[PDB]
Write a protein that binds this DNA or RNA. Structure first.
Ligand SMILES: [Zn+2]
Ligand SMILES: [Zn+2]
Ligand SMILES: [Zn+2]
Length: 84
DNA sequence: CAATGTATGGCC
DNA sequence: GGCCATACATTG
């Protein structure tokens, strides 16, 4: 079972374990070509670029409202939830 | 592995 | 309320 001994935390697979340990280094090699903000992992930088592009790719199919991140949309769906 | 999905919470 | 970073997951 993959486990970070600093946090005492388990991971299901190796990939997130390696990413977690690299975040533990403190290094931020992935930088934005626009605002020069640096990031631990490329995943985070990819999500960052949407703030510059303005694309709200994630749309509620109930009320047509649009969102920057899928997580925001998922949160929003709790508002339509509560009606059977 | 990358892509995609979920979850959290400070900040405006 | 949602933007946004951060951090975990499963899927292909
Ligand atoms: Zn750790
Ligand atoms: Zn930037
Ligand atoms: Zn909606």
């Amino acid at each position: 079972p993959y486990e970070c001994t600093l946090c005492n935390k388990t991971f299901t697979a190796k990939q997130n374990y390696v990413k977690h340990m690299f975040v533990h280094t403190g290094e931020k090699p992935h930088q934005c070509s626009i605002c020069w903000r640096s990031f631990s992992l490329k995943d985070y930088l990819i999500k960052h670029m949407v703030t510059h592009t303005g694309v709200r790719a994630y749309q509620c199919s109930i009320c047509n409202k649009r969102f920057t991140q899928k997580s925001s949309l998922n949160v929003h769906m709790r508002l339509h939830r509560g009606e059977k």
